């Protein structure tokens, strides 16, 4: 019964953990791309003050 | 584009400055001279009436 109980728990969540990691990886790449926009906007803020 | 627009606003001060000097000259010189012109015309109308 112990093996059967864990088999259902493992199988259901086996794929959920993988795709959560994939989503985090994509967000990290997207955040890095948005970092360049922040640097560009930093110069824009300085110009707007003038 | 913001930097270019900043230069345009900065350069616009020159037009406002010369406009103030132009208006000041008109009040100090042109307007009093026109008043003398109108007074002489007023006298001429009476003479033509005579």
Give the Å distances, CA to CA, from B38 to A35, A39, B9, B50: 71, 66, 41, 19
Does residue B43 sit at the A interface (CB-CB below 8 Å)?
A: no
C-alpha distances (whole Å) from A3 to each of A7, A11, B46 are 6, 12, 125
Which value in Å is the resolution of this experimental model? 3.7
Kindly determine whether residue A48 and residue B3, on different chains, have CB atoms separated by under 8 Å. no
Element (H, E) at A43: helix A2-49
Nearest C-alpha neighbor of A48 from the set B42, B3, B28: B3
- For chain A, the maximum distance between any two Cα atoms, rounded to a whole number of angstroms, is 73
Question: CA-CA distance, A10 to B1, in Å (whole number)?
Answer: 57
Count H helices and E strands in chain B, helices first.
Answer: 2, 0
- Residue contact B6–A47, C-beta within 8 A: yes
How was this one solved?
A: cryo-EM
B5, A47 Cβ separation under 8 angstroms? no
């Amino acid at each position: 019964e112990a093996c059967m109980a864990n088999a259902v728990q493992f199988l259901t969540t086996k794929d959920q953990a993988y795709w959560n990691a994939v989503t985090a990886q994509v967000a990290a790449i997207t955040a890095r791309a948005n970092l360049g926009i922040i640097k560009a906007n930093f110069v824009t803020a300085k110009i707007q003050a003038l | 584009a913001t930097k270019a627009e900043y230069a345009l606003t900065k350069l616009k001060l020159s037009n406002e400055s010369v406009t103030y000097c132009t208006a000041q000259y008109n009040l100090s010189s042109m307007l009093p001279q026109q008043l003398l012109m109108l007074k002489n015309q007023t006298t001429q109308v009476a003479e033509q009436t005579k």
